[PDB]
Design a protein around this ligand. Structure first.
Ligand SMILES: CCCCCCCCCCCCC/C=C/[C@H](O)[C@H](N)CO
Lengths: 245, 58, 297, 50, 58, 58
């Protein structure tokens, strides 16, 4: 009655039998902008079932000496499907999300993961090691795409903030003893009712192994982590030609 | 006091008691905030709410 | 009207925020009820699942044998107005006589509260803020002495032409708000409203403000949110010829009518630049302190 | 009297023996009822925990 | 407040709410103007007013 | 006057008459204390109270 769950939205379905619970971000469900919050004067388009569906992004490799990965949202969905073709033509953009991270292991493996949602996760660099040069992160590190990016110093989250207080935001834990999936429903968090979908990334997903992996010689040595996410209540406004970046 | 209503609070559930000597309401004092908490937003943000008397995963 | 059945029985266009929580009034702390010994089966209030993500809901009465305490500790100190309405130093403007920093009797200061580390760490606890302000300008000589000197503060909104020099024709303040003070009086104090085009300020803005091919020359515009660039603060010694008293201006901002959204972790490392969360690469210092072993203190 | 709340709502001084059993009269042995074949699910009267 | 009424507004359709501490009304504060517009004076100053649904010259 | 009630007296039998111009009640003036004495606490702290007309030890 609580261990098993099913997520049906659009034409996709995720069924899992070792789930913990479906967390709700800040007690608020994703919705459409009301007439008070709205700024634009054109009617916003809203594809119902053609964008509110799950997109399985990529398969990672949780090895023994892993550090962590991060994906910037909604940068990961600008080349996939009708959602990746609507955010290239349109200017304004508004959507919640629904993130579901699968990571499976046997009953002989041990380890934990921290699946976090950090709003406006601003990447900062090491300033040349000593802290003299005013360096800045490149474009292939700030918005990594659908392949993520490996964290170089995961204790400070590559942003100056410590990892031990990360659970004040949305967090679920993939502990390979009891559960195997972490599902988070994120509402739309921005100061503006709509936003551009090509430069501003709203929040960043963080998957960091807190407790390490361990197994004995004889089990299979590779444990994959897959991210699966679905936009919810997507809206677009303002047509133009197709520009990539 | 007949003045403008253009402070950075207007349209909220919190009712203030401030003093003001000008025509605009952003020059007023800080005043006494209402004491309304919400622990269920950051601490128990789950969909089905479980009782403390019962184990959640059965 | 409508005749199809997959729209008249649909839920497209749900505008209201379906909230699971409901804010209750809590003027003091919560009391404690009397609890006795309990040796039952099935009902366990001490075993939870941290994998769910929610925190502990274990009352104190369900773990020990408690006493009835009528708690009357007020929680009126930890609110947002009682935490941020304390004026801290946010900027300092220098006006020397013979030098290379500001040798022409004027200095232009861009408005940002992220220049000093003690105020910066408090306001970066949250992501979005929405506040008024009460600025305060305390002017003195570098040796602390008060001299009979007249000064003009000018708030330059974003767009207006900055003064090139002290005798420039932008100082005539036909529409810019200006403050004329001497130094032999109490310090000036204004009230700045919420002056942003957005609905709230933001100290962390992940992304770029422009379009186009972002290469190695245009990388410094990352994180520069233009909903926070509020203009330029300008000072001058009100006169034609050269003055003879050196000046130092200090700015103190306190926030009022504060609303904050979306908390986040607080920084533990040293700051290095303004509006740039860089840190030292080699000198990564842990948050707590170290001991010899874990078995002993 | 009493004015504290952790004594007036306490259970200190329970003197009666709170018994879970209650002795019933049994002059003879117990009879046997008619039972038919039963091929159901979930309801098992032969499996216990020692 | 018993004072003189000799400000530079008297005899208009705009009603003010000002403060004043003297006997003459031109030393008072600026106050809150009434918000009455008239776009039909500089933008559509024509004799016969045409509907936006119809072409004017037929 | 709508203010906070957090002075160092609140919850006593002494009723004050003070003036205050802030939102907190510890910045108010000293005011007029009520004149209630109790000589029976330090001077006659005995269990059985004896009359002044009678010798105590008989
Ligand atoms: C005579 C006028 C006095 C000057 C008044 C300046 C008003 C500006 C409003 C101050 C509010 C703080 C602005 C916050 C922005 C932060 O610096 C940026 N988000 C980070 O650089």
């Amino acid at each position: 009655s609580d261990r098993v769950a099913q997520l049906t939205i659009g034409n996709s379905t995720i069924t899992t039998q070792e789930a913990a619970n479906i967390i709700v971000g800040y007690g608020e469900w994703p919705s459409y902008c009301s007439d008070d919050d709205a700024t634009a004067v054109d009617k916003p388009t809203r594809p119902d079932v053609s964008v509110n569906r799950f997109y399985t992004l990529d398969t990672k490799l949780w090895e023994k000496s892993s550090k962590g990965w991060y994906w910037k949202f909604p940068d990961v969905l600008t080349e996939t499907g009708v959602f990746g073709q609507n955010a290239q033509f349109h200017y304004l953009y508004r959507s919640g999300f629904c993130i579901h991270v699968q990571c499976n292991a046997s009953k002989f493996h041990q380890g934990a993961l921290l699946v976090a949602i950090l709003p406006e996760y601003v990447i900062g660099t090491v300033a040349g090691g000593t802290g003299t040069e005013d360096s800045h992160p490149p474009y292939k590190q700030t918005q990594p795409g659908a392949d993520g990016f490996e964290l170089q110093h995961p204790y400070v989250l590559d942003a100056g903030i410590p990892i031990s207080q990360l659970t004040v935001c949305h967090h679920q834990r993939i502990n390979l003893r009891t559960n195997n999936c972490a599902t988070i429903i994120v509402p739309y968090m921005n100061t503006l009712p709509f936003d551009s979908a090509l430069n501003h990334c709203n929040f960043g997903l963080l998957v960091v192994p807190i407790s390490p992996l361990d197994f004995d010689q004889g089990a299979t040595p590779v444990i994959p982590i897959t991210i699966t996410l679905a936009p919810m209540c997507s809206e677009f406004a303002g047509l133009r030609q197709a520009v990539t970046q | 006091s007949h003045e403008n209503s253009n402070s950075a609070t207007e349209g909220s559930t919190i009712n203030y008691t401030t003093i003001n000597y000008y025509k605009d309401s952003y020059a007023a004092t800080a005043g006494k905030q209402s004491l309304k908490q919400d622990p269920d937003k950051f601490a128990n943000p789950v969909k089905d709410i479980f009782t403390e008397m019962a184990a959640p995963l059965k | 009207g409508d005749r199809v059945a997959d729209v008249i029985e649909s839920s497209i266009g749900d505008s209201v925020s379906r909230a699971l929580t409901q804010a209750l009034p809590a003027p003091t702390g919560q009391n404690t009820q009397v609890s006795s010994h309990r040796l039952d089966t099935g009902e366990v209030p001490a075993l939870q699942a941290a994998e769910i993500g929610a925190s502990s809901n274990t009352s104190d009465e369900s773990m020990i044998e408690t006493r009835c305490v009528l708690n009357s500790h007020s929680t009126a100190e930890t609110t947002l107005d009682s935490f941020f309405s304390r004026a801290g130093l946010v900027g300092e403007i220098d006006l020397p006589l013979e030098g290379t920093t500001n040798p022409n009797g004027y200095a232009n200061w861009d408005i940002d509260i992220t220049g000093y580390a003690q105020m910066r760490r408090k306001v970066e606890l949250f992501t979005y803020m929405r506040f008024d302000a009460e600025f305060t300008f305390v002017a003195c000589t570098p040796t602390g002495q008060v001299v009979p000197q007249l000064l003009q503060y000018m708030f330059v909104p974003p767009g207006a032409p900055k003064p090139e020099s002290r005798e420039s024709l932008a100082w005539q303040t036909a529409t810019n708000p200006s403050v004329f003070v001497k130094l032999t009086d109490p310090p000036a104090q204004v009230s700045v409203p919420f002056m942003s085009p957005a609905s709230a300020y933001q100290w962390f803005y992940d992304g770029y403000p422009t379009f186009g091919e972002h290469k190695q020359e245009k990388d410094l515009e990352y994180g520069a949110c233009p909903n926070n660039m509020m203009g330029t603060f300008s000072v001058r010694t009100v006169g034609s010829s050269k003055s003879k008293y050196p000046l130092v201006v200090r700015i103190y901002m306190r926030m009022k009518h504060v609303r904050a959204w979306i908390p986040r972790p607080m920084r533990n490392q040293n700051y290095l630049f303004k509006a740039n969360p860089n840190y030292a690469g080699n000198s990564i210092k842990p948050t707590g302190t170290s001991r010899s072993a874990i078995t002993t203190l």
